[PDB]
Every structure is written in C-alpha cells, then in structure tokens.
Design a protein around this ligand. Structure first.
Ligand code: DQC
Lengths: 50, 50, 50, 50, 152
C-alpha cells in the first residue's frame, strides 16, 4: 500500500498523518513531529442525575 | 441545615500511613519527626537522592 | 507526493464538470487554497479505478 | 473526555538519506515556533458550533 | 583508562538540583560540582588543576553537590561511554541569546572553546540550532499556563 509505495521510488514525500513507532522507523527517515497524538475515549454528552 | 452539615462534615482522623503521603512528603512546623542520630536508619536514609 | 484519504486531514470532493472545481471561502472570507488531485476508486469499479 | 496515553507524533516521512533530509526539518522547526500550526489548528481542526 | 572532559549546566528544578556540601565534601550520592562565578577560561583551568591534585585550595562556598534527573542520565552515559567527567555551574544561568553581537550563558562559555558538553533543561530552535549542533530530543513539552485555583 502506502508505505509500500514509499519503497518503490516513483514518489518520495509522504505528507499525511503517518505515525512513527520504532518498527516503522527503520527503513525511512522522518522529521521532527508537528503534532502530538494518542488514543482517547469518549462516552456521551455528560449529563447525569436529576 | 448548617448544624446538620457541620455535624456530618466533622471527621479529622487520617493518621499517617506510609512512605507516600502528603504529610510525609514535605516539611512543616507541626510535624517535626526525628530519628536517633548516626545509627543504622539515618545513614541509609541519606543516600536516597530521590 | 502520495497522500492518504482520512478525514479530517485531507478531503476528496467531486470535480466540478467544467474542468476546475468549486470556489469557496472561509467564514472569514479567507482564500481557501486547493489543488487538483487524481485518485482511484472515484466510483463504479474497474477501468484503472476511474 | 479522559486523558491521553500511548503518545506519538505525526511526522513527515522521507526516504533514507534523501536529498532533502535536512531542509524540511529546518523549515518545519522555524514554522513550528512561528505561530503557524496554531493558526492552522484554529482554522481547520476545531470548530465552535458546540 | 577513559576520557576526561568537562560538562557545563544550570539549575532549574527538577532537572538539576543543588545539595549543600558535606562535612569535608565527598558527595554521598551526588557529583562534586564547582561554582566559578566567572566567564574566564584560564581561571577555570587553574581551579580544575587545583581541585584534582595533591594540594587543593578553594573557598568552601565554591563547592556544591549536584544531583537530579539530567545528571542521572549523564551518569548512565558515562558508564556506557566509559569516561569520567567534572561538572561546574555556568557563570550566570541565562541560557543562550544574542546580544551586542555576542553570545552568553551556555553557548557563551561553549563556543569560546572552553567546555565539551551541555546537559540541562535547554530548548532547541533556529538560532541555537544553526551556530552549534544538537542531538535527538529526549522529552516532549508544551506551554501550559498557571492560575491560582480553589476560589471556592
Ligand atoms: N486520524 C487519523 C489516523 C491516523 C493514522 N495514522 C497512522 O499512521 C495509522 O497507522 N493509523 C491512523 C489512524 C487514524 N485514525 O483513523 O484515527
């Protein structure tokens, strides 16, 4: 797919929300991040009780 | 209403517990606690830079 | 460059038939920038995924 | 709701030792301090209908 | 059987604390650090020679015991990198900025060809990253604002 295309040499820049974990950080090189992110949870409009 | 709320509120208790306590994490004047000098405890209880 | 469709980071909108696409503006009337992107699986199925 | 966990960063990926391995880093830093990401975040990622 | 070099640093909690000196100054659980209060290379070299020798002479006020986070991680690299190190507080504690055509602080005492490292709370952006190098990041910050709470 996408990363795979990056190992094909027809286009190089990959400008889109690509994470950087260690396993994926072996075969290509990134820059300093421009956004922090993490897994988060939502439930509902908080409106309990009466 | 105020009297009932005050009666419900009163519950000081809260004896010191362990090694991670707000009372046992910072100094004050009301909690001067000691230990006999130059003896077993005090030597060990000095190396912990944390 | 190669980019991944995933809201709300990069969009994909139907091409206006004449040859260009919509001319929209922000709530502040600022010049919403855009470029022309060709991508597969627009609709239907085969034929190089349209 | 909730906190964040499992941090990460949406970098910009580049081929190993690619010719632009440095200049994109320089520009992204100089921007990333010069109030740009905040402007873009206001204009695209957060809304005020809520 | 290992390299010998200086490192220059700062005082910003909780990266690099300060601990008052011993009865004689060995630092149980700390590193022996020295306060020059002067941006002069020869003076520092003089002080180092006086310190690591068989005849020392230094006011006790100049000595301190440095310990904390960043020093901890420096100790791990010195172990892994197999080299000893000294340590001395910077002259003034003003980071690195341009002024009168000059520098100051960390860089002020570093580009002057004096020290060999710099370990501290220390940002990176543009100007500093051009004149001198920088390594990979090891911490991810932000800018939070602070307001007195519990208005009740
Ligand atoms: N946004 C976004 C986003 C970005 C991603 N970026 C990645 O690199 C990935 O593996 N999964 C992702 C998943 C999402 N996602 O659907 O939430």
């Amino acid at each position: 797919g996408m990363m795979g295309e990056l190992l094909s040499g027809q286009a190089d820049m990959i400008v889109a929300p690509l994470t950087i974990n260690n396993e994926r950080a072996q075969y290509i090189e990134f820059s300093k991040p421009f956004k922090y992110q993490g897994l988060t949870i939502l439930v509902k409009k908080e409106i309990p009780r009466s | 209403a105020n009297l009932a709320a005050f009666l419900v509120v009163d519950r000081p208790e809260e004896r010191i517990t362990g090694i991670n306590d707000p009372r046992l994490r910072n100094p004050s004047d009301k909690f001067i606690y000691a230990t006999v000098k130059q003896s077993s405890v005090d030597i060990y209880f000095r190396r912990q830079v944390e | 460059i190669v980019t991944i469709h995933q809201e709300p980071f990069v969009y994909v909108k139907p091409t206006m038939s004449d040859g260009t696409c919509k001319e929209e503006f922000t709530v502040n009337g600022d010049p919403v920038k855009k470029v022309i992107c060709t991508g597969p699986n627009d609709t239907s199925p085969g034929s190089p995924r349209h | 709701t909730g906190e964040l966990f499992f941090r990460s960063g949406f970098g910009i990926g580049m081929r190993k030792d690619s010719p632009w391995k440095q200049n994109v880093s320089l520009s992204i830093l100089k921007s990333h301090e010069n109030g740009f990401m905040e402007d873009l975040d206001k204009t695209w990622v957060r809304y005020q209908e809520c | 059987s290992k390299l010998h070099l200086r490192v220059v640093t700062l005082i910003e909690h909780p990266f690099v604390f300060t601990r008052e000196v011993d009865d004689e100054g060995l630092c149980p659980a700390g590193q022996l650090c020295l306060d020059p209060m002067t941006n002069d290379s020869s003076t520092l070299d003089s002080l180092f020679s006086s310190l690591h020798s068989s005849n020392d002479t230094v006011p006790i006020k100049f000595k301190k015991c440095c310990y904390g986070y960043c020093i901890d991680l420096l100790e791990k690299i010195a172990e892994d990198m197999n080299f000893d190190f000294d340590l001395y507080i910077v002259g003034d504690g003003k980071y690195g900025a341009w002024k009168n055509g000059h520098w100051t602080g960390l860089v002020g005492d570093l580009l002057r060809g004096t020290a060999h490292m710099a370990v501290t709370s220390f940002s990176i952006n543009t100007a500093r990253s051009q004149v001198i190098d920088f390594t990979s990041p090891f911490f991810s910050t932000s800018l939070g604002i602070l307001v007195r709470t519990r208005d009740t």
